[PDB]
Design a protein around this ligand. Sequence first.
Ligand code: 7MA
Length: 506
Amino acid sequence: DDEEFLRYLWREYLHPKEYEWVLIAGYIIVFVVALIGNVLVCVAVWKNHHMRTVTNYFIVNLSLADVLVTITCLPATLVVDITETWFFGQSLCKVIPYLQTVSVSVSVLTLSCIALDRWYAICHPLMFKSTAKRARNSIVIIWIVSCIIMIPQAIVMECSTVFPGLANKTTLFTVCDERWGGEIYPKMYHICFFLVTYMAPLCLMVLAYLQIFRKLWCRQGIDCSFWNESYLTGSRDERKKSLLSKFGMDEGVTFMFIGRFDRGQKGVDVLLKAIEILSSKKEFQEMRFIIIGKGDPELEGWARSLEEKHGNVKVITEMLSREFVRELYGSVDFVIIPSYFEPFGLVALEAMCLGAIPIASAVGGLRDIITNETGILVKAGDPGELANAILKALELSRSDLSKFRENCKKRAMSFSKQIRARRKTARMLMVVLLVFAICYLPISILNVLKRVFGMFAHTEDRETVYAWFTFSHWLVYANSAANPIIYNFLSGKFREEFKAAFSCCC
Ligand SMILES: CCN(Cc1cccnc1)C(=O)CN(c1ccc(OC)nc1)S(=O)(=O)c1ccccc1C
């Protein structure tokens, strides 16, 4: 009667759309999934101390922004897309678009700081001393910048009431939309809006992740299935004696260098000078040197001269197969890596996997790999320091070295594990970036085409354009539901925490 009469009146007022059933269904699904998932992300990182990383701090910030828009903006957007009218008054006409755009800005700047942190950690040779307070300062900056830059958005939003009807106005409708005082202002503002919220951060993040991919996959990594001691037969003593026998050398503490002969990069000049220095001491007779490489013909001549002079020095300018090099690593006592510059100690990791104790310059990746219990670090470029470290290694070799070789093997495996873990994380972040870029493409392009280029002004098919806009709105909100699913599929820690959450209630 009376209650049915009022429902009837709004039905006569509001004209329904044929696709609103799937829109409502999709919004309800995205609402529940985004809410539950992002809440679980937050509680997973907050209640479990193993989740405390800078990346996960940024991920929590992203989930918070997403929860904000899911609770305060998604219902309003659904209602407006269904009814094409603003029922919530003037203040909410300001506030809700402000919250929405602020959350977009927070999201894109959070992804940007994620990309930047990974780039500094991976592509930059240095590392930040601060991790947690760095993330906190970044997050506060992100929110402050986001809230400030979207102030114009809130300023231009206005309620406007339109009175349809020929002569006497019996009905009206209020819309919430941007109010501009000219044709140039919306074009300029929405060009800037597209640049700041979508295009420029996307380009920067794509460049950063290209550099990160190139570093993590093409410039790093060691084939652990090949560089493995399981392929070696017999004990290390037997292999060393067989090696020295085949090389026409007496038994002794065996040092190996492998690399290009150059001046200022791989450091064979430092090694040859250190060998000349050691040649005057009696300990030199207890030592054997295997110098493998090619390059500078003057350094090749110097090395051959040392070989012709000393029976405990052998130089190999021939190209050796990887199986032979693996035999070398698994039988020599020490590998000498006197690089001036060494961004990735690949030789060091390959040698340590096979139990060879590295003696390396403290430069770059060698510093990252080698510790005081897994090798000997020397000042780069100093032949006297290198000779002293070689004498130190001889004195060490007078006793059992097996614990040092085991520490080298464990450290190399652990480093390879870190490399793989960083690869998995970078991959998850790249998927997140790709899904963000897809989810926000339609609305970004449609906003430019409407505001900057003025399309859809006099369109014959306005129903199609309105469907495209409602779809782009929903796709934006579905991004918030998609992120936790991504974390569950591409992160074993998030997956375990989600399983624990869903099991504590079942
Ligand atoms: C200028 C902002 N914009 C363009 C845009 C480009 C890229 C990312 N988000 C929005 C709009 O289309 C408008 N904005 C919007 C609309 C729907 C929606 O669904 C996710 N998200 C944002 S809005 O200004 O916040 C707005 C305006 C009027 C009523 C409600 C809302 C939320």
